[PDB]
Coordinates of N, CA, C and O in Angstrom, one line a residue:
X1 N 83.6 137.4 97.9 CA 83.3 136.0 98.2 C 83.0 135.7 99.6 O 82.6 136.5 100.5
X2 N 83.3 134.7 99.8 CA 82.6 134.2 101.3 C 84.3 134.3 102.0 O 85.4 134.7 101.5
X3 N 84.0 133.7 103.3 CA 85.0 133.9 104.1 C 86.0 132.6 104.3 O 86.9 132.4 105.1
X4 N 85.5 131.9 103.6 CA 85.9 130.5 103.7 C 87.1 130.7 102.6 O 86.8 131.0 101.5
X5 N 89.0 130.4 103.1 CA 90.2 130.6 102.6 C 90.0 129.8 101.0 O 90.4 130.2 99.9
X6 N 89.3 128.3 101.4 CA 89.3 127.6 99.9 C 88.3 127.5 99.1 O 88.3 126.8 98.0
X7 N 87.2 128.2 99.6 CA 86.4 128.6 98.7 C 86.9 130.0 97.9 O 86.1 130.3 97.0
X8 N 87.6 130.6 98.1 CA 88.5 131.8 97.0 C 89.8 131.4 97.1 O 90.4 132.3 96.6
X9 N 90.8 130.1 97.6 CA 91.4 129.7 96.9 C 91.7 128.5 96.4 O 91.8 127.4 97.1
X10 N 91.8 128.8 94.9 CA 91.8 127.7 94.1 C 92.5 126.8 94.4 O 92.1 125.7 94.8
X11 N 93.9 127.0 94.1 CA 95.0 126.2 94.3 C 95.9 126.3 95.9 O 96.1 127.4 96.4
X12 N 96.3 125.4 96.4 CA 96.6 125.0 97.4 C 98.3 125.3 97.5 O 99.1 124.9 96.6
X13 N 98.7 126.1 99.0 CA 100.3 126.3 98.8 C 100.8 125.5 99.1 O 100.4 124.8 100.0
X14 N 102.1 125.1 98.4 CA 103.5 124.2 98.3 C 103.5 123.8 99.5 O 102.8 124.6 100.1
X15 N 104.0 122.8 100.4 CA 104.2 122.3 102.1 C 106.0 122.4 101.4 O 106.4 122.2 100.2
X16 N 106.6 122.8 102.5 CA 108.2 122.6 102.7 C 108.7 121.1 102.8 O 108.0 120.1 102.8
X17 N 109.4 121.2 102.9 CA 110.3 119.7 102.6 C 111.4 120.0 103.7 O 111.8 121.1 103.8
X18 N 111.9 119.1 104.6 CA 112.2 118.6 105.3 C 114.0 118.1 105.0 O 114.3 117.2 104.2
X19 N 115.0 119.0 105.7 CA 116.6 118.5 105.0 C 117.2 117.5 105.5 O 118.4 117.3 105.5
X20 N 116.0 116.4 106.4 CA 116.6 115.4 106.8 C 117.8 114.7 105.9 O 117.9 114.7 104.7
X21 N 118.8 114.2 106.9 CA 120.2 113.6 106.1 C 119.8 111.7 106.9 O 119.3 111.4 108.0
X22 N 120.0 110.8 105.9 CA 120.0 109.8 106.1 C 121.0 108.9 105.8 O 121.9 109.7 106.0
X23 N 121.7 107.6 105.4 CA 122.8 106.7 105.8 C 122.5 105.5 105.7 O 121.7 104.9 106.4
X24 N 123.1 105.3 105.0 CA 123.4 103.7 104.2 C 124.7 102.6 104.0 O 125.2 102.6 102.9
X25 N 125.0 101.9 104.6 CA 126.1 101.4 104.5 C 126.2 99.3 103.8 O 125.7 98.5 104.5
X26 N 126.7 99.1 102.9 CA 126.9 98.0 102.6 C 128.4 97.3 101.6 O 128.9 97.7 100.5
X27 N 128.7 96.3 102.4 CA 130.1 96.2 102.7 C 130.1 94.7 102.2 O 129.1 94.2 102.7
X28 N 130.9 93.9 101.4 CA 131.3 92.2 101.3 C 129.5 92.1 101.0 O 129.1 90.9 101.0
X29 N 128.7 93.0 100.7 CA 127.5 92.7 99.8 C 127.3 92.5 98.5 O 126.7 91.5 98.1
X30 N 127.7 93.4 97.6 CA 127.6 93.7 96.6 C 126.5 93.9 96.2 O 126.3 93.8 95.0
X31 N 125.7 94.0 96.9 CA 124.3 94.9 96.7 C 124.3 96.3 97.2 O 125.0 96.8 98.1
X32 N 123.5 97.1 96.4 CA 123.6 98.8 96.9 C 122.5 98.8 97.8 O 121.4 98.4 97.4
X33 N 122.7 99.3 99.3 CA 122.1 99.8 99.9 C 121.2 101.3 99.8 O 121.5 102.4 99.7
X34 N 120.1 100.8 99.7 CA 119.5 102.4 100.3 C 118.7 103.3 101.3 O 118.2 102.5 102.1
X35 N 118.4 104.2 101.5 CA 118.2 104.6 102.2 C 116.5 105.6 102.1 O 116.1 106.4 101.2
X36 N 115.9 105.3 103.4 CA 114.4 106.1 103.3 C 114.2 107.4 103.5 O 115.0 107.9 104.4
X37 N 113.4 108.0 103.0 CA 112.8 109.3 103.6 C 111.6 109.3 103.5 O 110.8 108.5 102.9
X38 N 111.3 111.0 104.5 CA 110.0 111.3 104.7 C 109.3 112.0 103.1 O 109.9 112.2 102.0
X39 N 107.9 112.2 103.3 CA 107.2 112.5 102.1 C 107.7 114.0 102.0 O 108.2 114.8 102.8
X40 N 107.4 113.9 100.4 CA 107.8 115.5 99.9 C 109.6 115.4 99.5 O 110.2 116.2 98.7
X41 N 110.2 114.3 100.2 CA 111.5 114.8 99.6 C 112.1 113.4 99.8 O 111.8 112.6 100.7
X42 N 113.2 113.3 98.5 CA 113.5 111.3 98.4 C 115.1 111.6 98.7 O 115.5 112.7 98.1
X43 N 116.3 110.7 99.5 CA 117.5 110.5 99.3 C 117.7 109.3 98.6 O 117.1 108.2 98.7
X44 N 118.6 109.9 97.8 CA 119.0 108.2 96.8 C 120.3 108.2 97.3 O 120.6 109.4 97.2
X45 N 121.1 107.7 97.7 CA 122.8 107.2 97.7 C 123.4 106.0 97.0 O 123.2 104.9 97.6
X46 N 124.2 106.1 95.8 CA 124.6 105.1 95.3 C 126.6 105.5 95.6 O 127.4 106.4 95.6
X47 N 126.4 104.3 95.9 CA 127.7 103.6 96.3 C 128.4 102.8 96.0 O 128.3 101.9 96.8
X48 N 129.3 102.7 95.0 CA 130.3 101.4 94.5 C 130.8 100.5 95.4 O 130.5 100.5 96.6
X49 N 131.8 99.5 94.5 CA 132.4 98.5 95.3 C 133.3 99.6 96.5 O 133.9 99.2 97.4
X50 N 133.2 100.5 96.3 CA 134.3 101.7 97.5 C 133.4 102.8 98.6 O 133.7 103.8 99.3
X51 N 131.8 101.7 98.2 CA 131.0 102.2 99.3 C 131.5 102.6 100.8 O 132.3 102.1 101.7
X52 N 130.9 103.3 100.7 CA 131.6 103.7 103.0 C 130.1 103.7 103.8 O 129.1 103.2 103.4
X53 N 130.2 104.5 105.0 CA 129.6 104.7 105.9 C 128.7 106.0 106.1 O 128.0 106.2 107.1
X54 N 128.9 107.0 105.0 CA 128.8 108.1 104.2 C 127.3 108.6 104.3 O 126.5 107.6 104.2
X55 N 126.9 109.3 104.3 CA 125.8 109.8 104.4 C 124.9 110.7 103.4 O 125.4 111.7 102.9
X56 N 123.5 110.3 103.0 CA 122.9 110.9 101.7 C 122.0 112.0 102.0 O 121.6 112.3 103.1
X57 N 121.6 112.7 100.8 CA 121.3 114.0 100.6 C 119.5 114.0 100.4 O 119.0 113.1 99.7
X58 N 118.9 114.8 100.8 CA 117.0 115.2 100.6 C 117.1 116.1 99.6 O 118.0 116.8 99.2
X59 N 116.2 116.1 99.2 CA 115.7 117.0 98.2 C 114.2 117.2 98.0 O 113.4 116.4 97.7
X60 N 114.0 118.8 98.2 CA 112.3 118.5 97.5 C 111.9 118.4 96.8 O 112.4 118.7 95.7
X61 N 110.3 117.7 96.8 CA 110.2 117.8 95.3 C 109.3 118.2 95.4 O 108.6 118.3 96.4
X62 N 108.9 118.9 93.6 CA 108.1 120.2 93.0 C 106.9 119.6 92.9 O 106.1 120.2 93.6
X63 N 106.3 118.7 92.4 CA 105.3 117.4 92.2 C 104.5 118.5 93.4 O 105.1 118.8 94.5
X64 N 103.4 119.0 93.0 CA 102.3 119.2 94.0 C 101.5 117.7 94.6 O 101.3 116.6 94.0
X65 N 101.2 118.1 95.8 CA 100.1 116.8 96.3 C 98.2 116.8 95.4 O 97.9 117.6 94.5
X66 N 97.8 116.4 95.7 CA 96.1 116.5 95.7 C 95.3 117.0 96.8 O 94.1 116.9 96.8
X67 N 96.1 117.5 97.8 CA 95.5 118.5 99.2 C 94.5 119.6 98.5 O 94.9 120.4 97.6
X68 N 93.1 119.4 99.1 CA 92.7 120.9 98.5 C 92.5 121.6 100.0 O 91.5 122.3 100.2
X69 N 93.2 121.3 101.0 CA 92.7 122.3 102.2 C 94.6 123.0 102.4 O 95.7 122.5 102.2
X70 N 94.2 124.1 102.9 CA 95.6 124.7 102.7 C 96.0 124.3 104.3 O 97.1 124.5 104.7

């Protein structure tokens, strides 16, 4: 084939995901706070009435994008 990477490949590699740690606090609210991340990977933190100052977890996700350039 030619020399061009995505004209012989088809499918495009995974991007890494990022272990940012993020933090959410909400107190005399009684609403659950939460918290943002970057693309490719979401923190959720749920927190009861015994919510703290505590810090939430990333995770990647598998979900390919629509990138066709590697």
């Amino acid at each position: 084939g030619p020399m061009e990477e995505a004209n012989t490949t088809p499918i495009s590699v995974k991007d890494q995901c990022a272990n940012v740690t993020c933090r959410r606090t909400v107190d005399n609210r009684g609403k659950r706070h939460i918290d943002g991340c970057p693309p490719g990977c979401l923190c959720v933190l749920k927190g009861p009435d015994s919510k703290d100052n505590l810090d939430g977890t990333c995770y990647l996700l598998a979900t390919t994008p629509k990138s066709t350039t590697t």
